[PDB]
Amino acid sequence: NVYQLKEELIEYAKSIGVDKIGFTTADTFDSLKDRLILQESLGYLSGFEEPDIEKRVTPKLLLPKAKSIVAIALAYPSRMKDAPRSTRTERRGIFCRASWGKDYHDVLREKLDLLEDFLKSKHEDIRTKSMVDTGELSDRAVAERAGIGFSAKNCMITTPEYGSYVYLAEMITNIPFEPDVPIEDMCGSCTKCLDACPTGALVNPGQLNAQRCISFLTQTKGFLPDEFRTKIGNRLYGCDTCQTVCPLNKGKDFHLHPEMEPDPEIAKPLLKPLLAISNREFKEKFGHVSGSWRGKKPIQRNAILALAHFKDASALPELTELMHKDPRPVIRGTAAWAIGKIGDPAYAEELEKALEKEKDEEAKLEIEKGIELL
Numbered sequence: 564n565v566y567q568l569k570e571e572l573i574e575y576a577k578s579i580g581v582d583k584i585g586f587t588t589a590d591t592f593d594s595l596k597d598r599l600i601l602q603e604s605l606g607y608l609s610g611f612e613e614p615d616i617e618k619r620v621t622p623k624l625l626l627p628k629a630k631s632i633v634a635i636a637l638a639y640p641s642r643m644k645d646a647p648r649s650t651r652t653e654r655r656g657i658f659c660r661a662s663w664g665k666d667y668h669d670v671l672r673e674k675l676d677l678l679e680d681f682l683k684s685k686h687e688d689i690r691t692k693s694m695v696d697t698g699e700l701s702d703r704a705v706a707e708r709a710g711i712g713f714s715a716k717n718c719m720i721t722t723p724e725y726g727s728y729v730y731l732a733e734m735i736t737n738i739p740f741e742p743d744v745p746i747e748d749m750c751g752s753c754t755k756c757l758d759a760c761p762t763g764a765l766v767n768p769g770q771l772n773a774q775r776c777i778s779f780l781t782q783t784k785g786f787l788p789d790e791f792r793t794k795i796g797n798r799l800y801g802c803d804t805c806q807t808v809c810p811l812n813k814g815k816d817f818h819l820h821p822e823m824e825p826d827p828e829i830a831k832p833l834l835k836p837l838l839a840i841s842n843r844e845f846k847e848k849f850g851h852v853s854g855s856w857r858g859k860k861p862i863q864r865n866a867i868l869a870l871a872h873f874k875d876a877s878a879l880p881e882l883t884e885l886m887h888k889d890p891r892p893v894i895r896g897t898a899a900w901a902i903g904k905i906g907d908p909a910y911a912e913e914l915e916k917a918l919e920k921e922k923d924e925e926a927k928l929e930i931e932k933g934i935e936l937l
């Protein structure tokens with residue numbers, strides 16, 4: 564009976580798109596509770612995590628009389644088809660693979676709704692609650708305890724077949740499902756991702772300092788610390804370095820979902836046109852990816868940084884214009900710093916005037932940096 568519903572569940576989920584499905588109890592995550600406290604004690608959290616730890620570790624708190632959690636995983640493409648090249652005159656920024664195509668929040672929400680629609684169709688007083696959307700449980704912890712994948716040294720849930728290139732979601736039920744078994748850790752003594760990390764955010768195997776992680780830094784709205792401005796590179800959103808360097812991700816590129824296929828002109832877009840994009844055009848071009856949930860402001864800021872990284876002298880006029888005209892202190896200051904970083908002394912005069920007019924001390928401080936660089 565219960566076993567039968569489980570088999571019909573697995574069978575149906577694979578037919579609608581789910582690449583891997585797992586089962587676990589609705590018991591509390593004791594090891595997670597301690598880790599969250601420990602990570603915060605060191606200040607290693609990102610601030611994007613859910614504040615209340617109690618809700619994060621107690622499945623029975625979110626859903627009364629719950630006895631199981633069903634975890635799913637969807638593999639996403641790692642290689643882009645017909646990707647344009649970042650030429651000298653036309654530099655391009657890059658979005659992380661976890662932001663290629665349609666937002667995985669919407670895709671995974673659609674799959675769980677069907678899975679809930681499936682359980683309700685049986686009409687057996689079944690109660691569920693999708694833990695996607697927002698956002699309390701630890702998707703990684705649930706996945707590991709449901710045999711979806713093992714927690715690798717780069718904090719990534721790594722599947723044997725699809726590697727780490729998978730989106731995770733789960734659904735709490737009141738069904739006495741029989742749990743699966745956590746798979747063996749296949750990292751061994753390898754430490755490639757730890758050394759390959761540009762900022763050394765992976766201070767320890769399976770331990771991340773999110774404050775140093777580029778993936779988090781690209782999503783911040785304030786000024787980026789100078790120690791990271793030269794290490795962000797051309798990344799507009801997210802960072803795939805500790806995944807691409809991984810041997811378990813070698814030869815892993817699944818195109819099993821058409822809506823996940825990246826649009827190469829927005830996945831790897833030209834840097835300069837992003838400097839002059841409206842709110843309307845941004846929501847139209849990028850509003851359907853995951854990397855737009857903070858707005859255009861952090862992305863535009865990273866475009867300026869990426870241009871200063873490339874020293875695109877042809878961007879100097881537009882950078883100059885943003886320094887004087889843009890209503891955002893973060894943009895004005897970043898542009899000014901970029902102008903100095905590019906190293907064209909002809910624009911030194913225009914930095915001077917802005918320094919007089921600027922009232923925001925942080926932006927005023929950034930202008931003084933660009934002046935120094937010349």
Ligand code: B12
Nearest residue numbers: 659661701702703704714718720729731769778779801802
């Ligand atoms: C906050 C957040 C971030 C933060 C920090 C993530 C982090 N590493 O802690 C930032 C903004 C940096 C980030 C980055 C990324 N993230 Co993110 N992020 C989240 C979010 C909202 C919560 C994660 C969290 O609470 N982390 C806190 C840590 C402490 O716990 P945890 O990693 O979730 O759980 C593990 C640890 O606690 C560990 N742990 C427990 N006990 C112990 C004991 C020891 C000794 C050790 C060493 C570890 C350990 O085991 C748990 C299971 O693996 C989740 C969604 C969700 N609701 O879970 C997505 C999520 C984790 N992120 C995801 C993605 C895709 C990414 C990026 C790859 C995006 C990108 N391309 O840049 C990077 C990866 C960076 C990296 N190397 O880890 C996916 C992961 C998919 C997968 N297959 O695993 C998730 C699950 C979103 C989703 N729904 O699919 N993200």
Ligand code: SF4
Nearest residue numbers: 760776777802804805
């Ligand atoms: S996503 Fe990039 S910055 Fe963050 S831990 Fe991985 S390699 Fe380091």
Ligand code: SF4
Nearest residue numbers: 715716750753756809
């Ligand atoms: S690079 Fe090595 S240590 Fe890092 S996740 Fe891959 S196998 Fe594990």
